[PDB]
């Protein structure tokens, strides 16, 4: 009944959405941290016992 | 007219049709991956003078910590790996391992059970038939290197027909003395020591002069698609281990000296392309069996 109008004209510069593109690129940085952190913990601690 | 054939190409028994789907293929891949770490854990144990690398590798493989009381057997993975090996060899062997157990074991490590990533070269020499006229003796012996001894006691030279099949890619023939070989309906060249042939070209005729016997040594190369993890040295060792451990003792089955002979014999059987895929998966399973049993003898 009350359906708000959503306009994203200011968000797009032509066909490029700057905010979405920059947000997605940060996952590549997170991938580097995950792999480096896992390797560093494995070498420092080795096999674990309980 | 006498007919001579290779001994290992005679009557290939039907292979099993179970455990060849995507789920079971990843189970064999996981077993190969985890058995490799089991062997590599022994080397790591020596460096640190501790058994904790081996405990970690055994626990992942067997879902249980090793105990000093009992002999290490490998647990459920070892039992599943042994049974699927039996099923691959013969159709008569039962398929006793449930799918749910294969499902659970295949989830231990991340792998793709794709058996067509790479290729391997198999060196068994297929001689389907050697046709010789009367008053001549032909003896075929050997699989990796086939020695064909031919003697004619007749008055004149005899023609011997060689049939190498249609599967092998390259066959090299080396004679004790220079001889003449040519395809059907082709002129015969000067005597030469070494011939390179393609079995698809057709039957080959060899002139056998009267006198001293002529012996031809044959070597063959065949390419069969195999997974990237295939290692022929480990597969061959696993084949001998399985035969000695009584994993192939089933009724109405044939026995072979090597996995090289086993895979080529099924290839040359009728509708043989069906058997090649199953035999390749068996080879990867034997590769895992060789590493697992060397780390945990029973």
């Amino acid at each position: 009944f009350a359906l708000a109008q959503i306009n994203a004209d200011d968000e797009f510069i032509g066909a490029i959405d700057k905010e979405s593109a920059e947000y997605l690129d940060e996952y590549a940085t997170l991938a580097r941290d995950i792999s480096n952190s896992l390797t560093l913990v494995k070498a420092a601690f080795g096999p674990l016992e309980r | 007219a006498n007919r001579a054939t290779s001994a290992f190409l005679d009557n290939p028994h039907p292979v099993g049709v179970n455990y060849v789907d995507e789920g079971s293929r990843q189970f064999v891949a996981v077993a190969e991956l985890l058995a490799s770490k089991l062997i590599d854990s022994s080397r790591e144990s020596d460096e640190s003078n501790s058994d904790v690398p081996f405990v970690q590798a055994y626990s992942k493989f067997a879902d249980d910590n090793p105990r000093h009381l009992r002999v290490k057997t490998g647990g459920k993975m070892a039992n599943a790996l042994t049974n699927v090996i039996r099923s691959y060899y013969s159709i008569n062997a039962p398929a006793i391992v449930p799918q749910v157990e294969i499902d659970r074991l295949a989830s231990k490590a991340t792998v793709s059970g794709d058996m067509y990533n790479s290729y391997a070269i198999f060196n068994s020499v297929p001689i389907v038939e050697v046709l010789s006229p009367a008053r001549t003796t032909v003896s075929i012996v050997g699989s990796d290197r086939a020695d064909v001894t031919m003697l004619n006691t007749g008055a004149g030279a005899a023609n011997i027909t060689f049939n190498f099949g249609q599967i092998a890619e390259t066959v090299i023939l080396k004679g004790s003395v220079p001889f003449q070989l040519a395809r059907l309906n082709q002129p015969m060249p000067a005597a030469r020591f070494t011939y390179k042939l393609r079995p698809l070209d057709g039957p080959f005729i060899v002139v056998l002069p009267v006198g001293n016997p002529l012996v031809i040594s044959a070597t063959a190369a065949t390419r069969i698609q195999v997974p990237l993890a295939f290692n022929k040295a480990l597969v061959e060792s696993g084949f001998q281990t399985a035969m000695n451990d009584g994993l192939f003792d089933i009724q109405n089955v044939n026995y072979y000296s090597s996995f090289d002979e086993f895979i080529i014999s099924q290839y040359h059987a009728q509708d043989g392309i069906n058997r090649v895929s199953t035999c390749v998966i068996l080879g990867l399973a034997l590769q895992a069996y060789d590493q697992m049993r060397r780390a945990l003898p029973v």
């Binding site: - | 179970n18 449930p98 799918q99 499902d103 793709s112 392309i273 069906n274």
Partner: protein
Amino acid sequence: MDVLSKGSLKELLAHLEKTPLEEAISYRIGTVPYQNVLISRNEYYNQLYPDTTSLIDGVSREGQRNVNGLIMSIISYVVSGSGHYIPNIGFMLLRRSILDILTKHDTGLVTNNLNYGIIARNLTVSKMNCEQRKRMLICFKLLAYKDGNQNDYEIYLNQNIPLKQIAPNFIPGDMRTVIHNQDQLAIVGIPAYRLTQSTELSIRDDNAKSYKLGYVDWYNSNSFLRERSEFNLIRLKDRDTKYGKLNGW
């Protein structure tokens, strides 16, 4: 697909009670069962791939008009998901449930002359997997109890060593045995491994993977019934109950 998803003896027998015989019978002509054929598998080979068609494939085949074909169509539906082409059976028989045919004398079908060894050989028991053999053995036990052939069923198990080890344990007249049974009979399900949209070489394996991939789509489809989220919307008659008993058991 729905029959292949059942993973317990209770669910399998419950499905057979509500499923009529016409679902087992297929009205597509299919092809003759035992033939050496060449099929196309372009993902793996350029040449045609030899194979032999069989009755436990997922595709309908032509079936004999005798009672042997009807039982063999029921078992193929249970183990493969599709039946065979046996037309003009009749309204009276087709409206009965699969369990009624296998277990009840009032259907009007006489099956006491059936030979379990010949039926198993025609169904290619050697090619069946562990779950498929367990499902077929369930059908044999129900038929034996209907005809008073319990002794013959046990002797047939004694002759076949692998079948005796995996034989399900339940008395076809007592519901307490069905509830206790813990055998896993699922053929399709949610896969723990990596399942890809790739072809398989043989007809049986390729057709089985189609049901496995179809079940995943069915699981996330709107037709699937989610007991956890929509239990109140189910009708009371067909709602899941702990004290669920088959009629006469």
